Amino acid sequence: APELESRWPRSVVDLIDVLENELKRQNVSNPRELARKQAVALSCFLGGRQFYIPCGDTILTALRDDLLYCQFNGRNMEELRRQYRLSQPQIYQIIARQRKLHTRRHQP
DNA sequence: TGCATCCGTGAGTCGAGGGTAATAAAAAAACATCATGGGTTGAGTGTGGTTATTGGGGCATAATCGATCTGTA
């Protein structure tokens, strides 16, 4: 049965909902139809091929990282370390990185 | 020389329906041939698998402030 599902399109189905919950959350008109055509593009784009999808929050780091730099206010280095369960080295690194990032924004 | 005889000629763009029909023999055998259906090749498209990683975070080993009790005219 699992091996039967191995080549099963069940994965396709699982995805329309993955698209649904963000589209419904973002509140756009007509979830279902938008997401199915949305999937068809992926099917043609990625038909019959090995693909590494960035796994296990790697993208979510970048968004976790952006908010943290926004809440870094110069003396709360302990506060956001509890509330993200991160550590001193992590905090320092992200801080310096996003600081350079914004400095490229303010500076030409 | 006169006679009949045959052989090419003769506009131009345009439109709309546009196709119709006097008749007729059956058996048999014989053969050709395509049509479907079932089975080997074979030709794929399908799917997991080991091994090259390059940013990131991390602990060492160093370093430059911040706050108070002992020594010198």
Swiss-Prot record:
Keyword DNA-binding: yes
UniProt GO molecular function: DNA binding; metal ion binding
Outcome of mutating residue 3 to D: Loss of DNA-binding activity and transactivation. No effect on dimerization
Induction: Expressed in the intermediate phase of the viral replicative cycle.
Effect of substituting residue 90 to P: Loss of DNA-binding activity
Cofactor: Mg(2+)
Subcellular locations according to the entry: Host cytoplasm
Residues that span the membrane, as ranges: none
Any Gene Ontology CC annotation: host cell cytoplasm
Binding positions for Mg(2+) per the UniProt entry: 3, 14, 17
Subunit record text: Homodimer.
Family: Belongs to the c/mor transcriptional regulatory family.
Domain comment (free text): The helix-turn-helix (HTH) motif is involved in DNA-binding. The leucine zipper (bZIP) domain is involved in dimerization.
Protein name: Late transcription activator C
Organism per entry: Escherichia phage Mu
Lineage of producing organism: Viruses, Duplodnaviria, Heunggongvirae, Uroviricota, Caudoviricetes
Gene: C
Whole-protein residues included: 24 to 131 of 140
